[PDB]
């Protein structure tokens, strides 16, 4: 068939929200504490992630229906999907050639090794890169990529959610648009949608593992003092 | 008369502790979030101060008698004198010519205006610079400068102190050395000591004013999120 004027307006909003919260030049990276190749990359990586949280928030506030939720559910949804949304949007800078995130010169070109110097292990970075590669191979349209992030964020299956019935509705409305768009606008995507919903499941595993490695990291005050107030709040358990 | 072998050992320890916690090249400043001329200098200034707190701590742990105090008194003494110790040690980089702190190229050369872009006002920066100038004019020997910091830090008149009787003793032992040294080793310092004890009083006023301007700053989460975990802990009231 063909998209409706409502589904289409949702797409215009999400794509504009993304454009407004994602700089393809990565020009703000110079304001982060400089990178350094005991966890010498932590200071820079913490600033980069803290920066991203702010962007994910600005993007979220523009997801249709999200801003009507209660402050608490918004907090609950951000806190639990934050790291997953960062992993998804970061794919835009991932390169299948050098298997790394290229956000600028040799300095802002993050290799698997660099993240290790932030306090993480291969037990996470492995499935992560494997996720990036697989996700990249889907050559998602900008419209599908932005929809995937709005769906991941509106997952009602998050610890701390209250109105897990309205959230469930919002996500479905979005899931509808994504499926319609793939059918109407993406030649060869008979199995796409399915492959995308699968990616959400991979994120939960990555999210889980990250929470563990992050927990260990936050209990050590010599490392914890390197994080930012926002990162500590978002990934903290003091809810 | 002449210094004793005990007073002399105190001086060797403090001067060595200072040398070990104060880099005259200011080479670590490149690791701070870059400076930028709503409070654009806050990120850099917060990192610089956070860095300094760590140095003041390392210096303090080496002050004779300090490490025997209770963890609580150490915390209590650091928290209340921190900003004063930073103001004193920063004098080593202050220049009477350009009335500014020169820690490197044009970038790391802090002008009165820059600190304003960190959220502070002339009501503080004025007495501050006036303090720096006056302090600089005393051409203190390295031995007297380091003693002044060890005395300021061991001020028993601090909110939160318990054994305010042992602290009072330690400070006196130090006050003795400073007075002896000026008499025996500093030609023309008949009024020095007195001028130095006076500087401590100026610090209390600067400290007081800073606490206010800092309080206002910490209540605004858009600014508070720019500070570091250590700065928030040291200047926080959550004791």
């Amino acid at each position: 068939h063909m998209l409706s004027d409502e589904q289409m307006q949702i797409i215009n909003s999400l794509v504009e929200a993304h454009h407004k919260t994602y700089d393809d030049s990565y020009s703000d990276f110079v304001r982060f504490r400089p990178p350094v190749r005991r966890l010498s990359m932590l200071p820079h990586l913490a600033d980069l992630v803290s920066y991203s949280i702010q962007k994910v928030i600005g993007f979220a506030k523009m997801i249709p229906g999200f801003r009507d939720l209660t402050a608490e559910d918004q907090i609950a949804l951000l806190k639990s999907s934050a790291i997953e949304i960062i992993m998804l949007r970061s794919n835009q800078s991932f390169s299948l050639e050098d298997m790394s995130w290229s956000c600028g010169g040799p300095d802002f070109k993050y290799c698997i090794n660099d993240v290790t110097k932030a306090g993480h292990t291969l037990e996470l970075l492995e499935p992560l890169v494997k996720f990036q590669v697989g996700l990249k191979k889907l050559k998602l349209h900008e419209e599908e990529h932005v929809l995937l992030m709005a769906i991941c964020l509106l997952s009602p299956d998050r610890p701390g959610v209250q109105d897990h019935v309205r959230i469930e509705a919002l996500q479905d409305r979005l899931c509808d648009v994504l499926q319609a768009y793939i059918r109407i606008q993406h030649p060869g995507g008979r199995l796409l949608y399915a492959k995308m919903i699968q990616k959400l499941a991979d994120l939960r595993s990555l999210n889980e593992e990250h929470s563990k490695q992050y927990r260990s990291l936050s209990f050590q005050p010599e490392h914890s003092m390197q994080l930012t107030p926002l990162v500590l709040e978002v990934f903290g358990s003091e809810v | 008369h002449m210094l004793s072998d005990e007073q002399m050992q105190i001086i060797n320890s403090l001067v060595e502790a200072h040398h070990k916690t104060y880099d005259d090249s200011y080479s670590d400043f490149v690791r701070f979030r870059p400076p930028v001329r709503r409070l654009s200098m806050l990120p850099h200034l917060a990192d610089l101060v956070s860095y300094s707190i760590q140095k003041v701590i390392g210096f303090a742990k080496m002050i004779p008698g300090f490490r025997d105090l209770t963890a609580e008194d150490q915390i209590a003494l650091l928290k209340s004198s921190a900003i004063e110790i930073i103001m004193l040690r920063s004098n080593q980089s202050f220049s009477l010519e350009d009335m500014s702190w020169s820690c490197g190229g044009p970038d790391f050369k802090y002008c009165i205006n820059d600190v304003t872009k960190a959220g502070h006002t002339l009501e503080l920066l004025e007495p501050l610079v006036k303090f720096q100038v006056g302090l600089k004019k005393l051409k203190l020997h390295e031995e007297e400068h380091v003693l002044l910091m060890a005395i300021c830090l061991l001020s028993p008149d601090r909110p939160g102190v318990q054994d305010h009787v042992r602290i009072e003793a330690l400070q006196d032992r130090l006050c003795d050395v400073l007075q002896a040294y000026i008499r025996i080793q500093h030609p023309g310092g008949r009024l020095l000591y007195a001028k130095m004890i006076q500087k401590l009083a100026d610090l209390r006023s600067l400290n007081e004013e800073h606490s206010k301007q800092y309080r206002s700053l910490s209540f605004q989460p858009e600014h508070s999120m720019q500070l570091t975990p250590l700065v928030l802990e040291v200047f926080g009231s959550e004791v």
Binding site: Q54, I57, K61, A71, Q74, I75, L78, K79, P229, L230, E233, V234, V239 | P221, E222, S224, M225
Partner: peptide, 10 residues
């Protein structure tokens, strides 16, 4: 208390 998240979400 999520002091910062509230501020950013407003």
């Amino acid at each position: 208390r999520h002091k910062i998240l509230h501020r950013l979400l407003q």
